[PDB]
Design a protein around this nucleic acid. Structure first.
Lengths: 73, 461, 533, 182, 146
RNA sequence: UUGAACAGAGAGCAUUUCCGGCAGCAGAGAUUUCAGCUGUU
């Protein structure tokens, strides 16, 4: 009537969009649930920004690393 | 009538002193930060392009290197600067890695050396200084195992005896050597597994599951009384030396060239195996390989776990060194140069970043575990930038452009062609097995984590 | 941890027996909601307040006050930004403020172009071009600014050094800029839209509007899309990737006169020379509400960043408050019958004496709107225009030169490519539309290949047989007629045979309906000679 | 805008805010500077005339060689250009294709002719003189500074009588003859 | 940056404070305006002990105000809520950063030591030990501090 | 490798102690605050 939407597919956006749901997820609903929150400093507070940017493995840099010892005591 | 527009204070924003830094106000509002997804995407692309910019892992070599070609390397578990290279001509060398130079060079035997270990001998006689001299155990080919002393200039509390603390003889040519580090018991591998202690010149005990030559062995770094030893009839054998009983055996499909444990889990281990592959086993159920690392072209030669329990380094008989994560099962990094041929040993340094690599040429080249993390200590803002970029990349992993860029690497030419040949083979094999599953009634799905096991000696329910 | 700002802060979106995935989801939910609440806590740190004009009587209105009383009543800084030029020599003037709110660009209709700081009264550049200059804008800073001309579009330096004659923007009429793609968008009197990248200096694309001369142009910032108003009565949203229009809209009769869009990307105001105005909901595309009888065609309207509406219809200028709300009371209206409070009075009015508003624009981060008319420039004081509390990582209205060059290099390194402009700003993140909703695996793909290689036996392709539905709309017959007559295929042999089968079963059901031989009549001769077939 | 450092340069190779691919060397500007002309439209219209001449020469090439149509027409065009002033040597029809430049037409312009005949001193000064109205072409003067002139009026360009210019000239030679009030 | 982090940590006590009846929103935002000016002038370069003292004096004043305000407005002399020792250990943390950025001025050192002696209910005997250790290792040639 | 005490650091862990809410007593700093005493919640 007085609204007309285009249906054609933007191929360059089809490059920029994903392949499928990738392996470590199960559902594209989960995939968007992960890609929901931007992580940038210009979108959350600084405290949560560090809290989201603190990586899993961390070392002190210049010290000898030791295999873990059992604390049975 | 109340009229009040915006008032601005110049002394609220642009401050007074001519040195005091300019103030920054914020407002976190999605109506005032428009292109969130596209901005983070382009930031991720800039991140991975900068990683390809700084992709320079190779960092140098060792002195002048040996004269024949490195066949064994041992890292000092006590320090960080110290390693020992056993050549193939017959000279052992102790290396300082702070300035990349030789401490000392000994003509140890006349034939080859087979294996090294660096350690702390707990004599019942007296305790040698663990800050003044470090002690090597070198296993030869001509029926010899010798314990050696090295003067190390780590400290300067002080300011003799330059070599050959003691010798040990046998009948056969030993192949492997290592040390149960509590009270300095050490296992040697020749014809049969012989367990020796230091002061007695004789083997304290002997074990063997069968009558096969045994080529490599290793104690686990934690739960430190368990021995794992391979066997030239494509076998893995476990021993519990607190019992002095050979614990378990499995027969594979190809000879397992090397083995090591992960010091962060202490009951798993990696086996570098001749069919071009690496295997990840648990200590309880040997029936399933917990994983298979599957990105080489020829005989693998050696592996080692990471002190961080996450990285596995492997060196092929092909002119290449691969590095894998524990998870993914396809090699993240690959190093190589035209100046090295047939790497035979690769080891980690005890601070989870630097890789010692002894190839057949005689040099010993060391590498960075990350192509990006410059070793230099960095300021806070830069540290935050690098970490923010890394988590952003790890998030935006599976977009196709980032996938192509980060996965795109350089390999040498013969190896690229040989990978594509093996790929063509695997595609044909897929077609054949698919037709077989069409035709026959019921062939059970034999998974790739178990397509390489022929059998255990002890079984389960 | 419930607050009042979560409604605005929350980013909108669309269970297993796998323990690692369960822990991952609970982890991400916990930290996401902590982060959103923390930003709602950052709410307190905003320095200032909004500007407001409140009556406090019922005898007094809002609009009855004027610039005289307001300039007398508010501070010396605002009364000093209350600019008032007088340029009587050259023709009517058009205005664009830079994005930082710190550099005014004025263009007369005859040749005058001036670029000034306007605040401490420095004068960067002045040029007396003779040819009719039509429109102008700063593009990225206060260092590069583009004017149109009669025919070819020019890029000038900060000083007035001529830098570019962009050939392929013929007869350009309305400029604008996309600051996050370095994109100069020109709408011509050719019906062509031209997107040009100023970074590499390359035309990214053209677009062909089959309407006619482009009447008016405006950009939606929160989507970075171009809105054109043509002559037919259409307003059309475009993006520089595809050569078809993204969407069209029949918003006015006669020609469109002006378009404007709120920063929140959720409200559009259009005005049309059939003395009409429309207030549009952009997303979902429902024209919300419509004023039908203005006593002049509206020249130019524009949105505030706080929710004011500015309407310019000749020698008048009016401003309305809270207009873009959805409820059926916020209809903008010139008068309230008997003090009817549900109707929406004008919020601030003004006339000019003998001019005609050529156009108008808000200042970004003060609260004034600037009017360009036939001989002078004026900057009316308005209480609630701009958000007082800006943000200093994108637009720093107080900008030292070192900070300028740093922000500029950073944005060059942080540009978007021109192809990521669509109707929805999370699609660049989300999955493909065509691919599966649930993640399938090697086993699933082997299974579907086996199913598609079993489909030749189990007839999976052609729709199956039901004698129940009428033969006109019968799916087999519609499939058969959708296929042509000249080539005959094995699938067509199959569909012919099953349509014969549907005819047989439906005729048996017709016999059992009309009342022929029924109740399990079994044809045992067919039974007895099915032995050989 | 920064002399931006190593890594950011190798990321931002292709950016340039000053010279683009499409403004080919700023050729128009450089010629405009060398001959002191006044409008971008003057340059581009001279471009169009040059372009049409070259399409003519191209189709004349595409004709077969030994047609008297081709020979007579190309020779007639060479007469037209050699009398016009744009191209110098009448014989190389290659130089019809390859020597025809907006530089050549713009040097056939008026003020360059003044600097040719050493009337004025430099070209900008010649433009000042023609704007101020001291120089006449034959019997009438010129005020539009962008006059084209062929050879047969190059013969008649001169300064106007009873100008202070001609007064200064004949005064220095000590030959002002104020019966003509020159 | 660091200013942002310190204000972020400063929020929740103010949140609890206006959540209880004793403060209102405009008072809150004005207080945070003063706080931003202080902390930003503390974390830029060019600051000094006079800036530190002015900040600590301001916070002591707001503690007195909150005392009298709560006392009047709900007759509860000490509410079981975060705010109180939050303000106090904010003061102590300001003292700490003050000595670390300037270990030189004995006057400021002395104000810190006198505040810690005065609030002897909630001090750590060990913390006064830590301060004396710091002071003696930095100045050992101060027999008066001995 | 163990057994005891000695000297503690204060850089770990649990309060299952009691206190950080009051009427009366006096000591102390330059009006106001740090600890104890009695009963109270």
């Amino acid at each position: 009537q007085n609204v007309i939407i285009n249906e054609k597919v933007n191929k360059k956006n089809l490059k920029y969009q994903s392949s499928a749901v990738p392996f470590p997820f199960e559902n594209r609903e989960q995939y968007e649930r992960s890609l929901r929150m931007p992580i940038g400093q210009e979108w959350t507070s600084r405290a949560s920004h560090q809290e989201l940017i603190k990586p899993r493995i961390m070392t002190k840099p210049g010290q000898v690393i030791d295999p873990l010892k059992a604390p049975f005591k | 009538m109340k009229i009040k527009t915006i008032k601005r204070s110049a002394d609220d924003y642009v401050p007074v002193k001519s040195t005091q830094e300019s103030q920054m106000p914020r407002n976190l509002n999605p109506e005032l930060h428009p292109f969130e997804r596209a901005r983070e995407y382009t930031k991720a692309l800039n991140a991975t392009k900068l990683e390809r910019m700084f992709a320079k892992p190779f960092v140098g070599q060792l002195g002048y290197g040996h004269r024949d070609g490195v066949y064994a390397i041992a890292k000092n578990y006590g320090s960080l600067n110290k390693l020992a290279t056993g050549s193939a001509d017959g000279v052992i060398k102790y290396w300082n890695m702070s300035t990349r130079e030789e401490f000392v060079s000994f003509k140890a035997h006349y034939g080859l050396v087979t294996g090294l270990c660096v350690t702390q001998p707990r004599f019942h006689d007296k305790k040698p200084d663990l800050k003044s001299q470090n002690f090597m155990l070198s296993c030869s080919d001509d029926k010899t195992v010798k314990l050696w002393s090295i003067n190390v200039d780590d400290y300067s509390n002080k300011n003799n005896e330059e070599g050959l603390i003691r010798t040990f003889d046998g009948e056969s040519a030993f192949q492997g050597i290592d040390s149960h580090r509590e009270n300095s018991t050490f296992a040697t591998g020749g014809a049969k597994i012989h367990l020796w202690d230091v002061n007695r010149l004789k083997p304290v005990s002997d074990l063997s599951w069968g009558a096969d030559n045994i080529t490599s062995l290793k104690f686990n770094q934690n739960e430190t009384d368990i021995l794992a030893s391979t066997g030239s009839d494509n076998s893995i054998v476990l021993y519990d030396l607190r019992t002095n009983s050979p614990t378990q055996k499995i027969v594979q499909t190809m000879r397992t060239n090397a083995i090591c444990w992960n010091p962060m889990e202490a009951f798993n281990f990696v086996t570098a195996n001749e069919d071009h592959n690496a295997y990840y086993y648990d200590m309880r159920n040997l029936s399933r390989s917990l994983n298979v690392f599957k990105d080489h072209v020829s005989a693998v030669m050696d592996v080692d776990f990471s002190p961080t329990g996450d990285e596995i380094v492997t060196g092929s008989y092909d002119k290449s060194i691969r590095i894998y994560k524990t998870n993914h099962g396809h090699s993240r990094e690959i190093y190589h140069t035209k100046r090295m041929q047939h790497v035979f040993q690769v080891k980690y340094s005890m601070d989870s970043k630097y890789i010692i690599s002894g190839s057949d040429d005689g040099n010993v080249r060391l590498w960075r575990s990350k192509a990006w993390e410059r070793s230099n200590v960095k300021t806070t803002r830069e540290k935050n930038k690098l970490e923010y970029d890394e988590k952003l990349k790890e998030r935006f992993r599976h977009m196709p452009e980032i996938k192509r860029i980060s996965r795109h690497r350089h390999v040498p030419q013969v190896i690229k062609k040989a990978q594509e040949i093996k790929n063509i083979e695997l595609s044909s094999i897929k077609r054949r097995e698919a037709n077989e599953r069409r035709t026959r009634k019921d062939m059970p799905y034999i998974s790739e984590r178990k397509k390489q096991i022929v059998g255990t000696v002890h079984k389960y329910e | 941890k419930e607050r009042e700002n979560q409604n605005k802060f929350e980013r909108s979106t669309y269970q297993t027996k796998d323990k690692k995935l369960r822990a991952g989801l609970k982890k991400i939910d916990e930290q996401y909601k902590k982060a959103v609440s923390s930003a709602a806590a950052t709410d307190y740190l905003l320095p200032e307040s909004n500007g407001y004009l409140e009556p406090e009587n019922e005898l007094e209105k809002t609009f009855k006050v004027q610039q005289s009383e307001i300039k007398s009543s508010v501070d010396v800084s605002t009364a000093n930004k209350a600019l008032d030029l007088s340029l009587k020599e050259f023709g009517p003037y058009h205005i664009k403020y830079a994005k930082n709110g710190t550099h005014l660009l004025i263009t007369g209709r005859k040749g005058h172009v001036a670029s000034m700081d306007w605040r401490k009264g420095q004068l960067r550049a002045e040029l007396f071009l003779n040819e009719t200059c039509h429109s102008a804008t700063y593009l990225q800073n206060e260092q590069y600014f583009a004017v149109a001309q009669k025919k070819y579009t020019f890029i000038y330096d900060h000083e007035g050094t001529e830098l570019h004659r962009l050939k392929q923007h013929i007869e350009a009429r309305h400029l604008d800029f996309l600051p996050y793609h370095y994109l100069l968008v020109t709408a011509g009197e050719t019906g062509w839209l031209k997107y040009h990248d100023v970074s590499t200096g390359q035309l990214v694309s053209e677009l062909r509007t089959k309407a006619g001369p482009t009447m008016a142009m405006a950009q939606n910032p929160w989507n970075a899309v171009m809105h054109l108003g043509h002559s037919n009565g259409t307003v059309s949203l475009w993006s520089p990737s595809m050569p078809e229009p993204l969407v069209k809209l029949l918003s006015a009769r006669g020609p469109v006169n002006s378009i404007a869009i709120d920063r929140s990307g959720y409200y559009m105001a259009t005005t049309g020379a059939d003395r009409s105005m429309k207030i549009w909901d952009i997303r979902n595309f429902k024209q919300l509400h419509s004023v039908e009888s203005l006593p002049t065609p509206g020249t130019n309207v524009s949105i505030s960043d706080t929710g004011l509406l500015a309407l310019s219809r000749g020698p008048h200028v009016t401003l309305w408050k809270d207009a873009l709300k959805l409820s059926g009371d916020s209809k903008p209206c010139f008068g309230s019958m008997g003090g009817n409070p549900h109707r929406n009075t004008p919020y601030m009015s003004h006339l000019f004496a003998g001019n005609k508003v050529e156009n108008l624009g808000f200042v970004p981060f003060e609260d004034l709107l600037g009017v360009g008319h036939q001989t002078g420039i004026t900057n009316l004081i308005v209480p609630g225009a701009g958000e007082a509390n800006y943000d200093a990582l994108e637009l720093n209205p107080f900008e030292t030169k070192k900070q300028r060059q740093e922000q500029e290099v950073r944005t060059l390194l942080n540009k978007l490519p021109a192809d990521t402009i669509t109707l929805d700003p999370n699609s660049i993140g989300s999955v493909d539309k065509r691919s599966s909703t649930i993640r399938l695996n090697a086993k699933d793909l082997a299974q579907t290949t086996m199913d598609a290689n079993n489909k030749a036996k189990t007839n999976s392709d052609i729709p199956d047989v039901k004698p129940d539905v009428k033969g006109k709309n019968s799916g087999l017959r519609s499939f058969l007629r959708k296929k042509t007559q000249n080539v005959i295929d094995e699938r067509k042999l199959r569909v012919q045979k099953q349509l014969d089968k549907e005819k047989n079963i439906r005729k048996r059901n017709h016999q059992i309906k009309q009342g022929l031989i029924s109740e399990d009549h079994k044809d045992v001769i067919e039974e007895a000679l099915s032995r050989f077939g | 805008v920064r002399k931006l450092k190593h890594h950011e340069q190798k990321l931002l190779k292709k950016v340039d805010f000053l010279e683009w691919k499409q403004d080919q060397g700023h050729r128009d500007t450089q010629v405009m500077r060398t001959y002191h002309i006044q409008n971008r439209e003057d340059y581009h219209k001279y471009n169009r005339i040059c372009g049409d001449i070259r399409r003519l020469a191209n189709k004349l090439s595409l004709l077969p060689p030994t047609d008297p149509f081709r020979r007579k027409h190309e020779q007639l065009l060479l007469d037209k250009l050699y009398a016009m002033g744009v191209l110098t040597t009448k014989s190389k029809i290659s130089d019809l294709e390859n020597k025809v430049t907006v530089s050549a037409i713009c040097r056939r312009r008026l003020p360059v002719i003044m600097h040719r005949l050493k009337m004025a001193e430099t070209i900008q000064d010649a433009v000042k003189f023609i704007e101020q109205g001291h120089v006449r072409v034959g019997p009438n003067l010129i005020n539009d500074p962008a006059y084209l002139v062929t050879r047969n009026m190059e013969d008649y360009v001169t300064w106007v009588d009873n100008s202070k210019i001609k007064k200064t000239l004949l005064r220095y030679r000590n030959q002002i003859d104020d019966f003509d009030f020159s | 940056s660091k200013t942002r982090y310190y204000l972020e940590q400063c929020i929740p006590e103010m949140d609890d404070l206006v959540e209880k009846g004793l403060f209102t929103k405009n008072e809150v935002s004005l207080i945070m305006k003063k706080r931003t000016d202080f902390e930003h002038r503390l974390n830029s370069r060019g600051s000094s002990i006079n800036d530190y003292i002015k900040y600590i004096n301001y916070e002591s004043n707001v503690n007195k105000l909150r005392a009298k305000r709560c006392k009047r407005i709900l007759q509860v002399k000490k509410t079981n809520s975060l705010s109180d020792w939050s303000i106090q250990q904010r003061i102590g943390f300001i003292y700490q950063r003050g000595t670390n950025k300037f270990p030189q001025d004995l006057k400021f050192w002395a104000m810190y030591l006198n505040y810690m002696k005065a609030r002897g209910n909630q001090t750590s005997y060990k913390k006064i030990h830590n301060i004396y250790n710091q002071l003696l290792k930095l100045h050992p040639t101060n027999v008066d501090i001995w």
